[PDB]
Amino acid sequence: AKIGLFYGTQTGVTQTIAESIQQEFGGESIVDLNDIANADASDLNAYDYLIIGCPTWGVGELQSDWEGIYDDLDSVNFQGKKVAYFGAGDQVGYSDNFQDAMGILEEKISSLGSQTVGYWPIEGYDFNESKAVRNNQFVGLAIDEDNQPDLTKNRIKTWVSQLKSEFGL
Ligand SMILES: Cc1cc2nc3c(=O)[nH]c(=O)nc-3n(C[C@H](O)[C@H](O)[C@H](O)COP(=O)(O)O)c2cc1C
């Protein structure tokens, strides 16, 4: 596929979201699903369009598989690549660290020469702080199954539609 989606998950939510995103894009012929846990950093080189999925754990911390591969990221060719992000978080229980993981990954990967695409509005959420917010918008799709599970489907639908234009589909 032209789009490589790499996700990490602890309790499975981010994987379900990744599968739904793949489905919304048109399936396996359009998006390849890859669990970062089973990947080498070089695996990301095979795609020119990437989607990075990661839930926030601990207190504003990276999901462990992403945490473990983080230091290998700078060896990857992200030069000029369009990268989109999504994450699972809990805005009620972690209002000061909502979606921090996605923010941490985007800060790192964008500093490696990539172009972030897929910005998302913060208005549909209620939180205090997030490392995933740059000038009043999320750097990617924020999903919250803990507090807003009923909004997930339409958010993915809307975001993928937005991404298609931003990627070139
Ligand atoms: C112990 C614990 C810590 C968490 N820490 C955060 C956090 O700092 N920020 C946040 O947005 N969500 C936080 N969450 C919420 C998770 O990101 C959320 O439950 C998500 O659905 C987990 O996704 P996963 O199943 O892909 O691992 C935490 C949840 C638990 C149970």
Side-chain angles (χ1 to χ4, degrees):
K2 289 185 194 303
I3 304 162
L5 191 162
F6 290 85
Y7 67 90
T9 192
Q10 194 121 108
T11 53
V13 174
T14 303
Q15 176 172 341
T16 296
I17 299 166
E19 294 164 337
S20 294
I21 287 172
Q22 177 182 51
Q23 183 186 4
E24 191 67 36
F25 261 101
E28 294 172 22
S29 65
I30 305 304
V31 175
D32 280 333
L33 234 47
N34 300 276
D35 187 334
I36 200 65
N38 306 323
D40 290 319
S42 53
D43 290 346
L44 282 63
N45 288 329
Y47 308 89
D48 280 346
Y49 302 119
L50 293 161
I51 297 178
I52 302 298
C54 185
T56 304
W57 279 90
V59 181
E61 298 166 75
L62 293 178
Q63 179 274 334
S64 69
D65 293 306
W66 273 113
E67 173 57 51
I69 202 174
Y70 186 83
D71 286 332
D72 285 340
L73 293 177
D74 58 14
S75 63
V76 178
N77 180 19
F78 288 112
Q79 214 62 201
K81 291 188 181 173
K82 291 188 180 169
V83 184
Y85 304 79
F86 72 93
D90 173 8
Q91 69 203 268
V92 174
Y94 304 82
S95 195
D96 302 331
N97 302 92
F98 185 50
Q99 303 288 350
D100 277 2
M102 166 165 60
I104 290 163
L105 291 181
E106 190 276 346
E107 182 185 25
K108 166 102 286 181
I109 293 166
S110 58
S111 76
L112 296 178
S114 58
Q115 175 192 354
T116 303
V117 300
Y119 289 89
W120 192 248
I122 67 164
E123 290 82 5
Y125 311 79
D126 186 28
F127 63 102
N128 297 315
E129 239 70 64
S130 172
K131 284 180 174 177
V133 174
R134 290 187 184 247
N135 42 259
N136 280 60
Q137 57 179 7
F138 280 118
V139 298
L141 179 61
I143 295 299
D144 185 342
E145 284 295 324
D146 298 315
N147 310 114
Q148 299 175 313
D150 296 344
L151 302 182
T152 298
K153 179 184 179 190
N154 205 51
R155 286 175 157 160
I156 294 170
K157 191 151 308 175
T158 303
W159 192 62
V160 170
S161 172
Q162 165 189 338
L163 273 189
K164 283 185 170 287
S165 322
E166 296 188 64
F167 274 155
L169 278 177

